[PDB]
Design a protein around this nucleic acid. Structure first.
Lengths: 84, 52, 113, 177
RNA sequence: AUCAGGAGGUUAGUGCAAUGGCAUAAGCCAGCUUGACUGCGAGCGUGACGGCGCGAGCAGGUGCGAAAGCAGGUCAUAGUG
RNA sequence: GGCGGCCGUAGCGCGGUGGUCCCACCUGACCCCAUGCCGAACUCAGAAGUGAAACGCCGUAGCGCCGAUGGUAGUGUGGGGUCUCCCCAUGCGAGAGUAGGAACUGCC
């Protein structure tokens, strides 16, 4: 029923995440990168996470959220190639 | 499997449509009251009735 | 990210910011009704008109009714079209339906917005 | 009428000679809860009728029957039993029933005292004590069977015993020492 | 037991193991309602390999909404040949 | 008080002082409109009474958070000895401690 044995986190296997979409090349508005699911907001390049900063770039495409609270889950403001 | 349990598998019946639809129904009332409007591969908005 | 104080009060709208346009705020006081065409990045007011200013034209009755709310909408919008704005979204933070805010919006469209 | 002067006139006067503070906090609006005298015990299936059939003449609307939260405890309580029956609401009504209640009909009972004991001690909710036979200017003399005697409460947010009851003796008398 | 006040980011609760998320809430109460739609593609699983799954479109059209929009079942990762 | 500009060191506690211009509290619910039980919510109307919640100013830095002047442990990377272990070269440098900041700026 409950949970016992004063223990912390619960484990299993190896993570199933990747680094798809380095971004500096074309990219249709879709989930750039993969780690955890369910998240929206970013509609372009919005790599911004606590640290030395983050980035992405060039690619004119309406929308394009991130994975979730990970590699810059925050939603910055627009960005395209330079001249789409 | 089959017997005396909640879930029960029964197919719909749009009427003239080619049937097909999977929807179970536990014993907790209501009983005789399939579901409602469905759109089988055929004419738009056709009758329903998962009961059989 | 966490929900900002403004998001907790849902008075703001991030979905209208993803487009990159302007708003049409409708403030209401038990005495006067205000309307503005503010643009993102702070409180940038392009055009605005108060029901009290409607008296400058020739308003006689009270300024806290529905017919006055529609009069202000036509004024704020008329000045907006003179500014150079065409489209705008309705932003009525906290209010009911069919109220004075709807009369303000219906008035804005009547002008050309 | 004689209910407006209180809260604009006789609220500043009673906050100048023995207060020296702001204008609020003493005394607002907010509803006033009117409870009922335990209906349980008395009799069986009834009395709930001669109830809401008397508490619908002194004021408006009818009482609502509500049960408790289905959760058994260390007491004889079954699931699905009507206990309580409370309904309190306001707006501007709870103002007149502080006029036609303590002015006429009293003095005019049959054996009223005059001296009351220190009801409350360290709060605000005063208290009371009335008998079953009452003479009201809004009740018939010969047609009502079974006399009903209900209490009278008042909710206040005071801080000290004094600086209070100095507003009660401003209309609702008597009160000797 | 219940009612009134105060303190109280939250240690509560959120179906299920654990972490993570959340309070003018994704939690509670109430009302209403019910997208678990059809068709077809692009992408994701170092290094090729199916079923299955998921994220993101388009075409038409169901439900709810003022609308954007939200569903391809139950917040995500076990409940299958 | 109105009207702008810059536009996250402005979290969270605490002190003094001023305005009957402005503004909420407040007051009143005739009516539009509205509460499953309650004009409280919701919506309308008037201004008797304050500034007590706001606001304008201005004084403490507690605690959070963001920068700066001083320094040893800690730690890469490559050769030395030595029973283990320790040392040298080279790129940097815990926490404790001394200070900084409680808005800024134009016009009526």
């Amino acid at each position: 029923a409950h949970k016992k044995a004063g223990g912390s986190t619960r484990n299993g296997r190896d993570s199933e995440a990747k680094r798809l979409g380095v971004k500096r090349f074309g990219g249709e508005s879709v989930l750039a990168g993969s780690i955890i699911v369910r998240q929206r907001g970013t509609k372009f390049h919005a790599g911004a996470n606590v640290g030395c900063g983050r980035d992405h770039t060039l690619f004119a495409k309406a929308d394009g959220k991130v994975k979730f609270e990970v590699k810059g889950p925050k939603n910055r403001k627009f960005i395209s190639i330079e001249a789409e | 499997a089959k017997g005396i349990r909640e879930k029960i598998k029964l197919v719909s019946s749009a009427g003239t449509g080619h049937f097909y639809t999977t929807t179970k129904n536990k014993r907790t009332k209501p009983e005789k009251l399939e579901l409602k409007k469905f759109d089988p591969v055929v004419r738009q908005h056709v009758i329903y009735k998962e009961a059989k | 990210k966490k929900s900002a104080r403004i998001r907790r009060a849902t008075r703001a709208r991030r979905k209208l910011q993803e487009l990159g346009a302007t708003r049409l705020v409708v403030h209401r006081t038990p005495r006067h009704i205000y309307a503005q065409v503010i643009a993102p990045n702070g409180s940038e007011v392009l055009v605005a008109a108060s029901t009290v200013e409607k008296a400058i034209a020739e308003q006689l009755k009270y300024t806290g009714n529905k017919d006055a709310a529609a009069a202000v909408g036509k004024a704020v919008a008329e000045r907006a079209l003179e500014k150079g704005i065409k489209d705008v979204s309705f932003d009525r933070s906290g209010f009911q339906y069919h109220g004075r805010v709807q009369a303000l919006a219906d008035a804005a469209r009547e002008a050309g917005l | 009428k004689l209910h407006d002067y209180y809260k604009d006139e006789v609220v500043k006067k009673l906050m100048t000679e023995f207060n020296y503070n702001s204008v609020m906090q003493v005394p607002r609006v907010e509803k006033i809860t009117l409870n009922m005298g335990v209906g349980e015990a008395i009799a069986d299936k009834k009395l709930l009728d001669n109830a809401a059939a008397d508490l619908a003449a002194i004021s408006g609307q009818k009482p609502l029957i509500t049960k408790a939260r289905k959760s058994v405890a260390g007491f004889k309580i079954r699931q699905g039993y009507p206990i309580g029956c409370k309904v309190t609401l306001r707006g501007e009504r709870m103002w007149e029933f502080f006029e036609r209640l303590i002015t006429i009909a009293v003095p005019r009972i049959r054996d009223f005292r005059g001296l009351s004991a220190k009801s409350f001690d360290g709060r605000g909710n005063y208290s009371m004590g009335v008998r079953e036979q009452i003479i009201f200017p809004e009740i018939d003399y010969d047609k009502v069977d079974r006399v009903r005697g209900l209490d009278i409460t008042i909710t206040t947010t005071a801080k000290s015993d004094e600086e209070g009851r100095a507003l009660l003796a401003a209309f609702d008398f008597p009160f000797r020492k």
